[PDB]
Symmetry: D2
Subunit: 307 residues, 4 copies
């Protein structure tokens, strides 16, 4: 009934909209499709996707700065194709899961260039709550674009048949409480006491209750998605070893914090809202705790308690 094309544009009418967004979302989708295709019949793959997003974004004529998980230095579009947009992406998230055919995907966040000053990285270093829009594409089982703007969150399923994305749920809102905790527990020797105490509670309900089911796919987007659609909680915390956890703020953490918050979720470092943290590096990491609010809250209480 409704393509992402129709949908985006119908939002642009809504906002007397720049629609510079539209071109941009449009190029983006072209990419996602290109990736879905490379992936579905396949670290070059890591690399292939990068270029694609970089190229399509350039030609969108709607972006000025690009931040890629896969690139040392931020990219500024040569002037002719310049756009008022700044885009940070994890081109395909889940290196580890590439070779064993586990779900992988693309995460992206869009900021409006606020700077009058010629576009520079500094343009990328804004807090997550400046995002104009954020989303991800998940290539597993099926492809799914999850787009989230100020309005709320909307899921579109890719139909390889007609080469379009198609609204399935819009908008989405996450269960207030869930049954699934997602964290890499090998790092158990390293976890702060709040996490630890927290994990135990999930395995040994004090109020006798069922213990949470545990899932960790290994791909952020896969885990973040399951989280979004099923409810529950997802964790990549700091350990003694990585002070700021492992997941980067620009292309991994904020988009998902955003998606999560717009869905009525929550996303904290354990000490603060992820969106509200203003970065000092285009490549900085940040502990992330997201998902059903009731659940994230429960853990925040531990953190508060332990300090």
């Amino acid at each position: 009934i409704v393509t992402l094309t129709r949908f985006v544009m119908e939002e642009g009418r809504k906002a007397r909209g720049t629609g510079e967004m539209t071109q941009l979302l449009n190029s983006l989708c072209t990419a996602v499709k290109a990736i879905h295709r490379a992936v579905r019949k396949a670290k070059k793959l890591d690399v292939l996707s990068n270029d694609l997003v970089i190229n399509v974004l350039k030609s969108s004529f709607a972006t000025c700065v690009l931040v890629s998980e896969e690139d040392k230095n931020a990219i500024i579009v040569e002037p002719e194709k310049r756009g008022k947009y700044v885009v940070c992406f994890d081109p395909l998230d889940g290196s580890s899961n590439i070779d064993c055919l586990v779900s992988i995907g693309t995460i992206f966040g869009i900021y409006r260039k606020n700077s009058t000053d010629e576009p520079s990285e500094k343009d990328a270093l804004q807090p997550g709550r400046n995002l104009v829009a954020a989303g991800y594409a998940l290539y597993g089982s099926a492809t799914m674009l999850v787009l989230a703007m100020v309005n709320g969150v909307n899921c579109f399923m890719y139909d390889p048949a007609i080469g379009e994305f198609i609204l399935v749920d819009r908008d989405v809102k996450i269960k207030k409480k869930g049954s699934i905790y997602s964290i890499n527990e090998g790092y158990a020797k390293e976890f702060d006491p709040a996490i630890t105490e927290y994990i135990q509670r999930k395995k040994f309900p004090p109020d006798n209750s069922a213990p949470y089911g545990a899932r960790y796919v290994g791909s952020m987007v896969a885990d973040v998605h399951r989280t979004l659609v099923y409810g529950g909680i997802f964790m990549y915390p700091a350990n003694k070893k990585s002070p700021k956890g492992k997941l980067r703020l620009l292309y991994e953490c904020n988009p998902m914090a955003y998606v999560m918050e717009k869905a009525g979720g929550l996303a904290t470092t354990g000490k603060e809202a992820v969106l509200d943290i203003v970065p000092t590096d285009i490549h900085q990491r940040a502990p992330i705790i997201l998902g059903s609010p009731e659940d994230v809250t429960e853990l925040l209480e531990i953190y508060q308690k332990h300090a």
Copy 2:
């Protein structure tokens, strides 16, 4: 260069082969393709796939009894289409992961009907080491058929482009030791002491070493595959609560035990080789511990030790 079609047939030449197998593998693949297709643009889905495997298998003219995770009672093909083969399948494995687009798949095992007696369930109740061939199809990221016969293990990638499966690795052999433990740890309050003691060791290496990474996707085939191609260990043990664990022997446990053993892996209940257990029910469960031999061994030592 080589389709599964060419490949199977080139094995049939090898064995002066019945090739009743060929028709059967062939119908099977037709199915996998049908499923890949339903899944990639989608519990009816659970149900849809069932029929497909049931129908294509019937029309193969090479099977007599069918055991399906999804059916209360075993199926015996009406006589005209009868075949000397008995096939047990989990039509799509990972109900829980269906809706959130995590990798799912099909597991299957093929036994030759030994019984002179008219085909009955009893035909299905053989030990895993009577399997003629066993395999699975994994719909995530990409599709992949993993076929394993007496010869060894071979991976074919589905190419949606020409509608064929195509050899990528053949045969496969698993790393002797790995870095990844896969188990649902919510059930931690229930785990026997050997598991427990075992999990700790992975998180707190006594020989100071890196602690294993942990992954649990939620789908058996997804986990079993990652295990196969990356090395490591996968666990669904009995707890106090489920005496014989959760995974069924016919369609989930044995195929994977087989795939695993033919790949040079290992697969124990913790007390015995999974293949070597002769079932009393077409729907019985069985604790399963598989993957890199060195790893499974390490845990077997715990089990032995604790008894």
Copy 3:
């Protein structure tokens, strides 16, 4: 390297462009894709395609009036989705060729609504040289969008793989003279003397020469395309029996006259340029003679001569 998306938009930048076009071409393409898909695995089909073009065009928000070969009465979009554009289409051209899997396609022409008056058919009744843009999609062998605006003519090939159209030739220009005449000769008893005399010349070169090859596929777009890319001439003339020939002016004749003229071709009724004829009916027919200029000219000379 270049999608139709990128391309269209890069023209819109060029013209400070309305880009209301872009949305429109975009919806159009969505359709073509939908049709390609229905067709490639298939008079309902005639009917299915109609709706698709009608719906996608409505939702484009860029059209006011629609003229369809398949509809008795012109369609005016309900006001909210109104656009400054008027679109006439043969939704799929070649009814006769549907069932026997011969190439079929979609022909379309876009006019800017000039009328201040509320949109009415009269909005459709303009001469072909008022077209803003015209084109067709050809579903045979491969899919191909041929888009032609004031600039010139450009061919994009559909890639079912990523669900995009991709520039292959742009712009196109037709050979000045060709080797192939295309006309349904069963109607030979009916042809005016100029056609007749003309056909003979092709079969019996007076300047001893090779006689033209003859092709008539049965689908206008198929024939018009072969004509465009190979050179030669295509004919659907009036006979005694159909005074104004068989092909309709709005959705069949003008788009192709346009495509042809922008490619440096020619398109006459035999008495006048097809574009320059101002219609009195949204469903009127008109004799059409198009293709390589040298060839069309040769026949015009006959016509002049015989009058």
Copy 4:
């Protein structure tokens, strides 16, 4: 409901069947699929397809000699992969129609090697009525395999979705009389008097009647198919200039004569049944007149009359 796979095999059961056929039809189909794919997103293409048919046929292990329109000399499979079958194919028929996206296809005929003598061309030089089976694949609009064995004629539609061919009509039988004559009339100066007199009758019905519609797509298979499913007549006769017409007997003429005869059609040189002509060259041409019997008969009467 029914794949070509199931169907072929269900014929092999029927005939206690060699099923060496099955492997062969199976490899064949693999090819057709490969070609459909190359074609649908594209003289290399002429050449690409050749190899594919050559390779897949070799690996079928069911053919000894191959005759290809595209190869000067007949091919004999290196001994290990030898089969009792001889296959003559036009790998893709309609060179002229390749670049302008008009329907193209593959024509093939299968003979059982009768010769005790080591396989040599002489193995290919049999009359058309020795064909074991004959068919074609048509890539236009949609893909369609038309398989015809002693039983009768059956049409399978390729479904790019699951990568299978699927029965749509089986068997087929052609209308006794039709409304469409198909011939390249540029060659009109060359046509024998019987053709000429014949063509006129179609344009000027003596019994006042409608004159036949005329279609000539340019691709043999396209024309032959339209003919088969719609009825009518198709002609590539000898002229003064080409004594034996243009179409080759092994890979173009006989398969279609066969398909046509098994469908209840007719196929004559004008002087004799095409099947009944025993060739002296793997690359020889032969005038062909096929299609609805009543129609072909009408023309045979002319031929008889004029001699």
